[PDB]
Amino acid sequence: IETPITANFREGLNVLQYFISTHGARKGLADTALKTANSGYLTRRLVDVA
Amino acid sequence: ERDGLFCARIFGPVKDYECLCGKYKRLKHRGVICEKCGVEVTQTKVRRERMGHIELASPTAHIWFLKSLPSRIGLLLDMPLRDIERVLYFESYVVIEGGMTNLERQQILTEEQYLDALEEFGDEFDAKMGAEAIQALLKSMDLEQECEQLREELNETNSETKRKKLTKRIKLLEAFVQSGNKPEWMILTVLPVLPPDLRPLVPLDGGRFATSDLNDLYRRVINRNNRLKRLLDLAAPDIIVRNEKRMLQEAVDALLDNGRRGRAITGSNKRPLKSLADMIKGKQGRFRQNLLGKRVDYSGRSVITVGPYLRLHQCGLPKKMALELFKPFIYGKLELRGLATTIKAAKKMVEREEAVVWDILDEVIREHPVLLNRAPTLHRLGIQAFEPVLIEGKAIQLHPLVCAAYNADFDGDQMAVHVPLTLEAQLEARALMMSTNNILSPANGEPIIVPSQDVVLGLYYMTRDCVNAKGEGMVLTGPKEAERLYRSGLASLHARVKVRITEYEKDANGELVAKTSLKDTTVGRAILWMIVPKGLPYSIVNQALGKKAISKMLNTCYRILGLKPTVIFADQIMYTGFAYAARSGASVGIDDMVIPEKKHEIISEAEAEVAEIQEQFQSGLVTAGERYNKVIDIWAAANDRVSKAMMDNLQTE
Amino acid sequence: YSYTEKKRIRKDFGKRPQVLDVPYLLSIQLDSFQKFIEQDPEGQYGLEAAFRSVFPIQSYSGNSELQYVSYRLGEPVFDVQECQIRGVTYSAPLRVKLRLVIYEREAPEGTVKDIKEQEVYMGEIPLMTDNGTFVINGTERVIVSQLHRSPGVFFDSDKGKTHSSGKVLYNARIIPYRGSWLDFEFDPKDNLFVRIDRRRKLPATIILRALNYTTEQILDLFFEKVIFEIRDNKLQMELVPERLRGETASFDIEANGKVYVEKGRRITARHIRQLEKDDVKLIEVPVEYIAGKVVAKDYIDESTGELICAANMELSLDLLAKLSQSGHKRIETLFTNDLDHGPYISETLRVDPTNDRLSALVEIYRMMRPGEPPTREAAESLFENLFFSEDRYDLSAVGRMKFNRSLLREEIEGSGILSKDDIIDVMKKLIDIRNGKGEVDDIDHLGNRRIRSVGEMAENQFRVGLVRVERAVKERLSLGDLDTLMPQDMINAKPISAAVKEFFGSSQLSQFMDQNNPLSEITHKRRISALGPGGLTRERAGFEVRDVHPTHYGRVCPIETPEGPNIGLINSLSVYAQTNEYGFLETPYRKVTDGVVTDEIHYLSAIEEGNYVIAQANSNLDEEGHFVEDLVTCRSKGESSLFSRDQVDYMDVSTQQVVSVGASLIPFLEHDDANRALMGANMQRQAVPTLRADKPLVGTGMERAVAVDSGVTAVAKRGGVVQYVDASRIVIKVNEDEMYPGEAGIDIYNLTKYTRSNQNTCINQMPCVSLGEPVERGDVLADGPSTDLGELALGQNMRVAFMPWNGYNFEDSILVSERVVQEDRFTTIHIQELACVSRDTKLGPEEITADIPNVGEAALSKLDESGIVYIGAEVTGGDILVGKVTPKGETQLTPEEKLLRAIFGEKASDVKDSSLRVPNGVSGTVIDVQVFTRDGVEKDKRALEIEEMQLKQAKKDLSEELQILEAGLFSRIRAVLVAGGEEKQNQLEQLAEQYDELKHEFEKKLEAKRRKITQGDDLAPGVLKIVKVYLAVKRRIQPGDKMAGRHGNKGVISKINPIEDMPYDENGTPVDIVLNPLGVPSRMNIGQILETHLGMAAKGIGDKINAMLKQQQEVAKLREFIQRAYDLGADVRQKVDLSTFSDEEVMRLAENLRKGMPIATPVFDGAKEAEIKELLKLGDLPTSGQIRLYDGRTGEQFERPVTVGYMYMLKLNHLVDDKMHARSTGSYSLVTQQPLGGKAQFGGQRFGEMEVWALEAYGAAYTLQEMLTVKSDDVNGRTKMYKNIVDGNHQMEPGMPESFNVLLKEIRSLGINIELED
Ligand SMILES: [Mg+2]
Ligand SMILES: [Zn+2]
């Protein structure tokens, strides 16, 4: 993004920084959830190969 | 019913060794059938093995062999799938032999083409409509005759494309003929129905035997068969009998494999319809039931919990859960000692839960492990055996070191448990699956069981130094005297000092060489050295001992000493680390997270740099593309300066 | 500060003032259903529009019709109280009026003899409750607000991997509200296409040909004309200056003796400008240039009489010579260029086989419905009824507005069904997007996302019922000769009733109310849902839509979404959100006209927010609402940047606009991360209702809002004074307000004392008011479950100290004290649900217990004479709640059997037992027993006693009112008659007659109430008597139970440690909880730490107030300290002072303020760090916020100063009693010999193929085979293994698996022989 997150968790975070940061939590949750399916898919075929 | 989908005569009887009418209803007469009624006598579970059939009026075709993937009916006859699919219905017939008339041996044709062709010749040439055409063409096409022509044609025809294509067809035809199964058995004349008990009628609300997906599909095949069977006797016209043949073919096709077709029901309060393919498939191939094993006897589960008191080779198994898990062994143990007179009396005592029954539980849970297991089994460490420790509580007490192997956070994630019966499984559980044996991981050489959070924090708290403290400069004999000063609170737990310590070492070939020297080491390091069992060097203890160094000490002891002393040493590190953490009492507050004083100065410089870059864009020099790269570099650099300011301030001030 | 709130006030921080207040949170459910169920005299989204669509209908050219005038929702059969307890649907009769008409044969529009009969009975549609719930069969259910793509055009992109060769797509999908989907998409070869209702692909030229257009008109409508003249036997054309741009010059361009552009160089701006300025429309072109461009229109020979060149075909040297030789001056041919006007329509016409309308209609009908033969009637009907039709197809007001807005039309509204011009416009617009101009529309933008609701969903399902019966009415009207018995018989109740009841009865949208928490109750209603009927499925899409978008900002919550498979699909509604009239979600903004910020608000829609610029909430307001800062931060069309002061058109209404109600309840939200804020919000919903409802110390603001709006706490209808306070009922005299038409006396509110909820939780209201305290309008009377003093509780505040303790508080575990479990704070009450109803067999009727056979005296003693369990008895596992005796006799009494029956004496003769028993595991005590005996069967002793209890309850409250109502007439006479005691004669009878009429109204009202208890007998066919026992059970907080906070910090209890071992401060008060320090650095949740520090200062100030109250320092000392603590800091956060210093109110305020004075910190604009430090310093505490907690078991002091405070804990509903289970021997499944299910009966714990690889990794094969052979399948193996373990010999005989034998039989059943050889 253009404007970076200036304020910390110790200080009072503004609404624009939270509304920007919520994408990282939502996308990060989806990628980690999708990675769990990829890990289960990867170990399936590697086990079946040998 | 007399001749239904559940039946006495066809399928099998209701009661164990009894007729339907009730003439022969005894174990003495167990061979003979019934005279009045039509029913044999047998066990209650004889229906599940027995089966029947359904005589089809028109010759039908199989669902898989028509489609599947390569089309076994098509490649055997040597023809395309599109023409064969149209030929299987009743819209476009296929010619069955006849070289006299101007037409191919397997030539498809429209109703108009059939009408025009029949007007000229009529006789001599022949062409069946539906699946009877494929059934006629199947038995006519000889495998041995075609194989002889293919062998001669391969050698004679000198070509790349001709020889390559003919080789694949000849090998498939030869393998099909050499096996045993002829082409005529692909199309279905008879249809074998499934056992009744393996497709049971589940009762609905109010006790009504609702028809299952099997029973509805088998009912459809019987209804269309009984329709078509009469229509041939009645001598119905070509349009009505052809329409019945389509719906009979669709009913059989839907029963055998419900997919890539019309599809019955489709989301009508019961999904599609359990076909014979979908039962063999089920949950994406029959894995969970047959291959996996499904649920197992002598099994249970509960919510996990912390267990620091329990050592590395045991776990806190619940008292109420463990009573049910070893239920057969309590009957044997009670009857062997002579408390319970018989099995009926032994059943009454354990159900009522007397005081004597609890003492028997501990007697048969000493040398009998329990296989703990987490749901997401990533690797071999996901299942492991432990000695069952009796504890008053429903929550299962997992070990601290084993938690790292499972990756089991204690936030409402229940771990299952299994009871290994017999001797060889208990021997395999104690030897192979044991936590004391399974110390090192399978993937890497480093140890799986290691210090994580509380042990690592307490080890750093103990093994540490400072600028100045109470009782710094003072020599002392050993760890016994050093512990007395530290525990009493005269000397500090972390201070600069120098005390003696007899550090052993295995220098010679199979011998413990002695040594002693007044080495420089802290008060906490002197007290922590007692956990190191003799052979380990003094250099490992006199350090920070934070995560990597702590884990390396366990790995070094395993190579030098062995499995036995490292198992004890790894446990004592957890006990010492857990106890030392309580002594320190660290706590991340609000004022603890101290931000840097130059954050406002750095933010002003970073913000001013963005204005300078923006000033160049409106001026003329800077462009839109260059502004994105320039602004991102200034913002990224400012984050590094802010992070380095906090890193410089918080680390050493 | 009104009443109830006067008892206890929270010290609210946060500098942002609330200009626009928080509205009624459960609006979306009520206002949508209010639009549905209401008499509207105009075309709006409601019941009249559902009728009027297919209200006036007529027979198949018969001149017979039945027009609908209006409807009338009658009175409910039972109210919400009676309907819930009995077990039926809460609904009102729909009295739909009608008017039959019949025109005369061979005559004009004039009726012979009409019969306008009474309103037809069209079932009973379900009504909505006060709080906003539907009662289906005595259970509160909620319909979630559906979300999907709105009706209208939408040009999708589908770029990237379209054809796997770096080729982007260009498709458009005209989605309707009702009808087939009109999709059109491109191809790899740049050809047009169409797909009717997501079907297989086909040519686009079949669509236009079906709607009456020729080959020449197809090219003319889509495509430049480009005329080619023929002057003096030579090639010429009208050379457009703009046409040559973006192309190489083939021939030498000249005009009137002047070379404009030479044959070689490209047509630049200088070349095009010369032709346009000079205005030369006559350029001499060559014959070779016309070879590439195809001809537009046809041109047959006049003299010869033959087709020279057909329409839509490529020209040539031979073709051009034939046209010129014949004598053709004009010659049209398509611009045709790769830059702008691409050859899409011309190429599509060549590939399309059908030419005429009959050929195109037959191909279109055959494509959609293959198999059947096309014809004249079928082809025209199928093509017409698909799109151009009223009954089948319908775009509606939302679709026509969206379609016109996308296509850039003048008119806002118009016709519902599509036309030839609209489809041609969509085809032309789709070709432009594929060419270059006009960018694609995004799916994540909320302008396209139409948010439907229960009101709109009920209107659709009701419309399905009317079209179903309409076919029956049309067929029946034509068959019937005379118009008699028409309106009642025609409009059948079953089609209308069964259709609409199926939606509320069983669907994806309509589901059970998640009622284990007032916050979970209110948030389930305020819920957006993507998945369901209409919207996209989970497997259908999994990208873009799941991710959060920038268009939200107060329409739906970015933070609140369930972590799992549906991550981002199930969105939560915001705090200040509100649905628009059209359909889309809105959000309020303050209208900033010029520099001064005005007070008037405005609801901006998703599409309307883009063009304007909106300022942020956190901004420094100057005098008269002026801009303090020069360059304030103002978002403009997604992106954020520092805009000007005067440029700001709009601004934010409140700081808690973006955050939802559940997210706003979390204090110090900004200090925590979005990941942990998402997790903490979800755990806040699952909190079980506590016994002792304690108020939160660290509040926020939405506590008082959620408690009143959810409908847990009993809010007052009209203000007044309390007459009689009690746990059962709370009456109140109105006095000031009163009833309108005289009469009346006082209000009444019967509190629900101990009742079962949806998720087995104890719902129990408690009175908070005094014996005779004054109360105002909109004030709490009785506090509901999980509430305290008119505010939301959820859990309880407990003392916490972050420190390690012997490895007990590891990872995510808590080390609670014995003082917590001993006080019975975290202990919670549950409510089970048992029932026994089976009867009506062929042998006889099943009796209700009446002393069952083959049972001891201990079993029979617990049951009464009728055979039912007593009120309040320890029902252990195995005991009989409700008895039974089934008729399975008639065996013919032999001499031996007859003597045995007479001597023993079990019952009537001989019967089988099927009594209800308590499940082996669960236990508790019986609190209530309901009996629903069917009509016809005589009522037993228990049923009459329960009916008499409800009758005497109904007698008491009605008679209680009569004491006030009858006294109004009685006491009035003694006042007037004593003054005048000739005159009083005529009026004396009127006073006595009016008194008797009021007394008769009591008897009439009591008879109706008494009858409703008797006649109210809901029962199915084959059901005689139905008893339902409710077993209450208490379960304390134990090791293993779930417990968490609001900041995303889950916990499980390790061990209940005695209070002597726990840490203690200087004063000697032992801490309750001990959390882990290690979790706070990694998981960014700084609000959890800040909540503890403010919580310590909150308790520290409260302990001072309790100390002042204990020592007794009078009103002078308490008033001075209370006023200073209220303000505390210095900023601009409202800060309401003492005002007047009340006498009674100040003393009552100090009592509730003791033992922890609460303080509210808002979500976004919460309490500061310096303000919290001053609060700690005010009530005797350090700035750092830590104390030297000495060790309990050791005695000595700790090394580091441990932080101490009161972080808010709440016990989640995930107990060990439900979770824990074991097994050994029991019931197996019939089909495959394996454990059936899991919960109860027999064990589960699925091993799976994953754990098999773990066992194989070690290499213990004997351990692995014992799972799936010895202890699972094989008939001889199970008996051998169990007997061997019983004898103590061990070993095993596994044999073959029975599940494998089924696999062979399933393989054998499909004509594939498989068998075990040898
Ligand atoms: Mg976790
Ligand atoms: Zn018989």
Curated annotation (Swiss-Prot), chain A:
Role this protein plays: DNA-dependent RNA polymerase (RNAP) catalyzes the transcription of DNA into RNA using the four ribonucleoside triphosphates as substrates.
Highest rank taxon of the organism: Bacteria
Effect of residue 29 to R: Resistant to antibiotics salinamide A and B
Effect annotated for changing residue 26 to C: Resistant to antibiotics salinamide A and B
Disulfide partners: none
Post-translational modification: Acetylated on several lysine residues in the presence of glucose.
This protein's name: DNA-directed RNA polymerase subunit beta'
Subunit organization: The RNAP catalytic core consists of 2 alpha, 1 beta, 1 beta' and 1 omega subunit. When a sigma factor is associated with the core the holoenzyme is formed, which can initiate transcription. The rRNA transcription and antitermination complex (rrnTAC) consists of RNAP, NusA, NusB, NusE (rpsJ), NusG, SubB, ribosomal protein S4, DNA and precursor rRNA; S4 is more flexible than other subunits.
Effect of residue 25 to T/V: Resistant to antibiotics salinamide A and B
Protein family: Belongs to the RNA polymerase beta' chain family.
Gene from which the chain derives: rpoC
Reported uses of this protein in biotechnology and industry: Co-administration of salinamide and rifampicin or salinamide and myxopyronin suppresses the emergence of resistance to both antibiotics.
UniProtKB/Swiss-Prot annotation, chain C:
Highest taxon, organism lineage: Bacteria
N6-acetyllysine: residues bearing it: 999, 1177
Effect annotated for changing residue 567 to S: Resistant to antibiotics salinamide A and B
Keyword DNA damage: no
PTM text: Acetylated on several lysine residues in the presence of glucose.
Assigned keywords, A-Z: Acetylation, Antibiotic resistance, DNA-directed RNA polymerase, Nucleotidyltransferase, Transcription, Transferase
Cross-referenced PROSITE patterns: RNA_POL_BETA (PS01166)
Pfam family, one: RNA_pol_Rpb2_45
EC nos: 2.7.7.6
Annotated InterPro entries: DNA-dir_RNA_pol_bsu_ext_1_sf, DNA-dir_RNA_pol_bsu_external_1, DNA-dir_RNA_pol_su2, DNA-dir_RNAP_su2_dom, DNA-dir_RNAP_su2_hyb_sf, RNA_pol_bsu_bac, RNA_pol_bsu_CS, RNA_pol_bsu_protrusion
Effect the entry attributes to changing residue 673 to A/G: Resistant to antibiotics salinamide A and B
GO CC terms, sorted: cytoplasm; cytosol; cytosolic DNA-directed RNA polymerase complex; membrane; transcription elongation factor complex
Reaction equation(s) it catalyzes: RNA(n) + a ribonucleoside 5'-triphosphate = RNA(n+1) + diphosphate
Record note on what altering residue 811 to K does: Disrupts the enzyme's active center
CDD domains on file: RNA_pol_B_RPB2 (cd00653)
Family: Belongs to the RNA polymerase beta chain family.
Subunit and interaction comment: The RNAP catalytic core consists of 2 alpha, 1 beta, 1 beta' and 1 omega subunit. When a sigma factor is associated with the core the holoenzyme is formed, which can initiate transcription. The rRNA transcription and antitermination complex (rrnTAC) consists of RNAP, NusA, NusB, NusE (rpsJ), NusG, SubB, ribosomal protein S4, DNA and precursor rRNA; S4 is more flexible than other subunits. In pull-down experiments interacts with CedA. (Microbial infection) Interacts (via flap domain) with Escherichia phage lambda antitermination protein Q; this interaction renders bacterial RNAP resistant to transcription pausing and allows it to read through termination signals.
NCBIfam families for the chain: PRK00405.1 (NF001616), rpoB (TIGR02013)
Described function: DNA-dependent RNA polymerase (RNAP) catalyzes the transcription of DNA into RNA using the four ribonucleoside triphosphates as substrates. Resistance to the antibiotics salinamide A, salinamide B, rifampicin, streptolydigin, CBR703, myxopyronin, and lipiarmycin can result from mutations in this protein.
PANTHER family (UniProt xref): DNA-DIRECTED RNA POLYMERASE I SUBUNIT 2
Name of the protein: DNA-directed RNA polymerase subunit beta
Organism of derivation: Escherichia coli (strain K12)
